[PDB]
Every structure is written in structure tokens, then in C-alpha cells.
């Protein structure tokens, strides 16, 4: 309804994005550095967790509409009850176990439980739109508020997880000059570690503090959402979604681009630290990226309004290529790194704002191709989001697995040559390859600013 709730419904988008951001950037750095797991098992954890997040979205989406309207609502008790366990199982991801055997299960189980509960919070919250009010204009305004707050929540998650963890940098042991295999298992023997273990406990306490702060924001936003908001076959669908070829072409293109950019997210969070060597201020670089993207999103809105969206995709997503090559070609420089970071932030904002506004156009084109369909309109978003998250999980798993195969050394402060070559390929070779293949498969998308017809007919 009025702003008496459209503001309360807005903050609900923050829990999913902050938790989802601080994870996506920092989790691979956590399991590899402060949790010190074997990169093979860390790859397993990342892959399985993001694949389970992708799987639990349709599961939960079906689990609703089968649950009865209780005294609290139908979609509201999900959010009311999943929040305590969500924040509990989220605190326990950033907590190192109290055991010497079964360390990987402690992270698999709790990352999967948190994915399930954050899904049981976001999917009923997402579906809460259609029950806020009966007027479509109010639902669209609430969706705009929600997306604004979600972008700002990405910003807050980055800022918090970077400034809390940045106060206690991760300690690194330089490569033993008296050793050739660079193994630490031999160097640490006969060597006191109380200082190093103390610094490691300090950074682990910083990660636990950041987890507690993010969980507190989760709890607070969930309480506001629950007190300020009071609400009032499928196989056929999957066979039909493959019969709208224009949607399929848009999906292939935007999926390749978004996959490139999430690969950038994770492996760049690691690459800034280990390859460039800015372990002390990589949080500032991540915050600069995110702030540039968030402040430049409205410019991209104006661009979409000025030119076609098919021109904005090319210009915005292609702006990243030269700077992504520059960052790996030229040596480390905190003045060049900030510039490539702000350019990559602009391009990230472009590549993530464009699909979100081009997909409703293929929805409108499908409403004209098969104009008798009831339902089968959010199945497109479901398919796109599932194949985004599943593929990003597969790619992050393969990235950490390749870092395992390159001889990633834990406790190290300078990684081997193959690890640096991989971290350079996972930011410039593979991402630029994927970006170009996406922008080349986007040439096969029919609506080329012919949306005027889809608009006037509607």
C-alpha cells in the first residue's frame, strides 16, 4: 500500500544481498586462508553450496502454495521462522570447528543449511509482492524500492565485511629461504607459532565479528519486514520455455556474460590479494568496485533510455575488456588498480542491469507469441536464475579446483608461478573469452530496439 509499508517491504531485500555478497566475494578467501582447508575440499564446498542454492529455489517455490494460510499469513511464517536458524547457521560458516577430523563437513552442512534457509526467506519474500496490494502500480513501486535497497545492500555487505576484516589482515608466512620445496610442513616444525597463531586467531575473530554484524542486520531487517508488512504443468512449462527461441538466445548471451562476471567476483577477490600483492587494502578495492557500480547504475538507466538496450549491452560489457587486459599486462600499481577497478565496476553495473530490464521485454514478446497463456511468466525468471546460480557454482568449483591443481600453498604469502598464471587467466583469459562469446551470441537476439511494437500492442 502506501509508504507506511513500501519502505518496510524495501529493507527485506537487504538480508539476502549482504549475506549473499560477503559470501560470494570472501568465502573462497575464507576457506583458503583463515579456515585453511584443502583447496580440493574448498572447491567441493563452493560447488555444492551454490548448486544447492540453485536447487533449493524451485523446491521452495513449489513448497509454497501447498502450505496453508496460517494466523500469521501464508508467506510470512516462512520468513518469521527461518530467520533465527538462518543467522545461526550463517554465524557457523565463519566459525572454525572445534575438531581435527571432519572439518569439511562442518562447512558443507552449515553452508547448505544457510542456503536452504536464506532461500526459504528470499523466495517467500520475493513472492510477497503479488500479495502486498491489488494495484499493480503499487507493486511496481515496491519492486523499485526493493531493487534499490538490494543494490545498497550489496554495497553494505561489501563495506562491512571489508572494513571489519580489514582491521585484522590475514597473516602470511614468507617462503622459507632455507627450503626448496616451499613446504611449510617442514619449516614450521621446531618453530614457535604463538605469534602467528595469535594473528590467525585475531583474523578469525574479525571474521566471526563480521558474521555477527551481518547476522544482526539480517535479524533487524527481518523483524522490520515482519512487523511493517501485513499481507492480504511444470514439465509443460519447461517444454514451452524451449519453444521461445528469442528468450533462449537472450539466456545464452546474458548467461555467458554473467558467468564471466561472477567468475571475476570470486577469483578476483582472491587475485587482488595473491597475484597483485595488495593483501592490506583489497577490501578498499572491492568497496571501490561496488560503489562505482552502484553510483553508475542510474547512468546506465539513462543510457537504456537514450539508445537501444542492444547498444548498451555492447558498450557497457565491452568497456571491461581493455581494462581487464591492462590489469594483468602491467605490473602492480595501486593507482592503476583503482582505475581498472572503477572501470570494471561500471561494466559490472552494465552487465547486471541490462538483463534485469531486457528480460521483461522477452516476457512481453512471449505474451504476444502465445497470448492465451495463464501463468508461465515467472518460469522464465526461474529458469534464468537457476541456470545463473548453478553455472556460477560450477565455475567457482572448477576455479578453486584448478587453483588446487596449480599447487596452491596455504599459509603462503607468495604463491607459486602456476598459481599466479591461473589467477591471471581466471581474470583476463577466461572472463574476456566468455564476455566476447556472450556478446557474439547476443547478435542472435531478434529484438533490436523494435520493442515499440511489443509496447503498443501489449
Amino acid at each position, epitope marked *: 500500500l502506501s509508504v507506511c509499508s513500501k519502505l518496510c517491504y524495501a529493507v527485506g531485500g537487504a538480508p539476502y544481498q549482504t549475506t549473499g555478497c560477503a559470501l560470494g566475494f570472501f568465502l573462497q578467501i575464507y576457506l583458503l586462508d583463515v579456515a585453511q582447508l584443502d583447496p580440493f575440499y574448498a572447491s567441493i564446498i563452493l560447488f555444492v553450496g551454490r548448486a544447492w542454492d540453485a536447487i533449493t529455489d524451485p523446491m521452495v517455490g513449489f513448497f509454497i502454495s501447498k502450505t496453508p494460510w496460517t494466523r500469521f499469513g501464508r508467506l510470512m511464517p516462512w520468513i518469521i521462522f527461518s530467520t533465527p536458524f538462518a543467522v545461526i547457521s550463517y554465524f557457523l560458516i565463519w566459525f572454525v570447528p572445534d575438531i581435527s577430523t571432519g572439518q569439511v563437513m562442518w562447512y558443507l552442512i552449515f553452508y547448505c543449511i544457510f542456503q536452504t534457509l536464506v532461500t526459504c526467506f528470499h523466495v517467500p519474500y520475493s513472492a510477497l509482492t503479488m500479495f502486498i496490494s491489488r494495484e499493480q502500480s503499487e507493486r511496481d513501486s515496491a519492486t523499485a524500492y526493493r531493487m534499490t535497497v538490494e543494490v545498497l545492500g550489496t554495497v553494505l555487505g561489501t563495506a562491512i565485511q571489508g572494513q571489519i576484516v580489514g582491521k585484522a589482515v590475514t597473516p602470511c*608466512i614468507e617462503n*622459507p629461504p*632455507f627450503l626448496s620445496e616451499t613446504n611449510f610442513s617442514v619449516a614450521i616444525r621446531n618453530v614457535n607459532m604463538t605469534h602467528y597463531t595469535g594473528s590467525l586467531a585475531d583474523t578469525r575473530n574479525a571474521y566471526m565479528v563480521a558474521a555477527g554484524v551481518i547476522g544482526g542486520l539480517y535479524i533487524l531487517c527481518a523483524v522490520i519486514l515482519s512487523v511493517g508488512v501485513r499481507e492480504k504443468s511444470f514439465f509443460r512449462g519447461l517444454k514451452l520455455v524451449m519453444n521461445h527461441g528469442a528468450y533462449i538466445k537472450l539466456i545464452t548471451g546474458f548467461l555467458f556474460t554473467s558467468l564471466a562476471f561472477m567468475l571475476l567476483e570470486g577469483n578476483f577477490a582472491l587475485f587482488c590479494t595473491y597475484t597483485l600483492g595488495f593483501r592490506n587494502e583489497f577490501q578498499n578495492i572491492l568497496l571501490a568496485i561496488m560503489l562505482s557500480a552502484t553510483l553508475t547504475i542510474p547512468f546506465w538507466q539513462w543510457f537504456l533510455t537514450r539508445f537501444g538496450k542492444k547498444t548498451a549491452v555492447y558498450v557497457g560489457i565491452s568497456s571491461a575488456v581493455p581494462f581487464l587486459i591492462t590489469v594483468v599486462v602491467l605490473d602492480s600499481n595501486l593507482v592503476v588498480t583503482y582505475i581498472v577497478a572503477v572501470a570494471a565496476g561500471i561494466s559490472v553495473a552494465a552487465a547486471f542491469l541490462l538483463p534485469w530490464s531486457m528480460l521483461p521485454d522477452v516476457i512481453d514478446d512471449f505474451k504476444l507469441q502465445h497470448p492465451e497463456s495463464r501463468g508461465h511468466e515467472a518460469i522464465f525468471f526461474s529458469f534464468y536464475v537457476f541456470f545463473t546460480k548453478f553455472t556460477s557454482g560450477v565455475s567457482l568449483g572448477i576455479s578453486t579446483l584448478s587453483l588446487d591443481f596449480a599447487g596452491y600453498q596455504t599459509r603462503g604469502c607468495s604463491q607459486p608461478s602456476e598459481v599466479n598464471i591461473t589467477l591471471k587467466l581466471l581474470v583476463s583469459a577466461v572472463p574476456v573469452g566468455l564476455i566476447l562469446l556472450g556478446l557474439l551470441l547476443f547478435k542472435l537476439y531478434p529484438i533490436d530496439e523494435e520493442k515499440r511494437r511489443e509496447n503498443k500492442k501489449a
Partner: antibody
Amino acid sequence: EVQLVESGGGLVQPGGSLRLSCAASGFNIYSSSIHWVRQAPGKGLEWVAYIYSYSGYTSYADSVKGRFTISADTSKNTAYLQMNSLRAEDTAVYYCARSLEYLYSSGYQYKWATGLDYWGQGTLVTVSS
Amino acid sequence: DIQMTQSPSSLSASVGDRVTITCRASQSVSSAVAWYQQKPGKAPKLLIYSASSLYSGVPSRFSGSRSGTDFTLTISSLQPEDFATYYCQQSSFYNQPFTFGQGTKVEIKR
């Protein structure tokens, strides 16, 4: 109890061959490191050489590089310092000393250092005609 | 090579006096110092490594400090068994030659 006993001394001719031995007890050389440090007669201590017996990493002083060669033998648990092409100024008392590798914090990095924790008794060599 | 220089080369102090011995490292940073003590005709003894870390079995009289590349060793109560020669050594693998300092002969004062 840790003990380091040196062997090999006496008079050397200028430009001769002398192998100083450092026998170890109460600890394994193959697991630990060994420094060799000479003290001239009536002068301050002067670090000579260093070896990490597991990998084989040896360092030498700028004055002894190319003349002295440090080594370790695990079959006897003994450090060795071979001295060839000796000038008539290397006459001194040589101590072998177990190292104490530790880590000092330089910001966030933990760099490696070494302290000579237990010193041998030192043996006297006189390089002179 | 790094030139470690002990600024006092002969100190005089009777029992009970606060003794201080400095050792300036030419290189600015990324170095550790190791303070040893040698009696006349006896092997040295590692007193303080890492510039502040007492060795196990060393009395608490000794105290080290890293004051901006100016490493320092202080004895709070000079017991009449501390009249020896104190050396500072460049303990760090990054600055490879672990060259010693000049020495600081402590002798009774009268």
C-alpha cells in the same frame, strides 16, 4: 642435554686444507641448522657460514665465499666446515652453534630469522708460516 | 651486507646501574636483531632474539626494544656477573649475511 663439541685445529699453512668438525649430542643435525662463527684473537665475533641440514641451503660470509664450504653429515650427526685457500688472517677461534629459526612480524608478513641459541665450545686455528 | 653498528664501544657501570646498549642497523626495516653475551674466554650466550624475545633460561634483567631500526638492549640491575661483551647480530634471512656488531665491553665503574 644439548652439546656441541668442535674438532680440528692447530697450525695451518697459508693456503691449506683444514676440515673443522662439529659433533652434536642431544639433538639431530639433520633436523636442525648449524651456524659457524669465528672470533679473531682480540677482535669481535664474525659470522662465517650457515647451513640448513634438511634442504642443504648454505650461506657464507662475503669474506669466505668461494674459500669455505659448509656441509652436514647425518650418518654421524656432525657439521663440517672445509677451509681451503686460507689467508694468514683467518686464524681465530671457531664456534659451531645450533640455530633457533623464528618468525618476526613485518606488518602482516612473518619473515624468517635465525638465532644461534646453543654455542659450541670453539676450537683455535692458527693460519701462519 | 648490512652494517650493524653498536654506538657505544666501551661502557662503564657499577652494580645496580641501568645499562643501555644500542645497535643501529643501516637498513631501515625487515631485519631482526639477536643479542648475545660473551664472557672472557667462554662461548657466547643468546640473550634476546627477535629484538624483544628473551631466550629460555635467561634472567629477566635483560630487555630488548626495536625503536625504529635502532635496536636496544637494556639491563635493569647489573648483577656483578654481567660484566661481559654484548654483541648484536643481524638475524633475518631477508638480509642474508648475519654479520655481528662491534661489541660493547661492560666494565666496572670507579
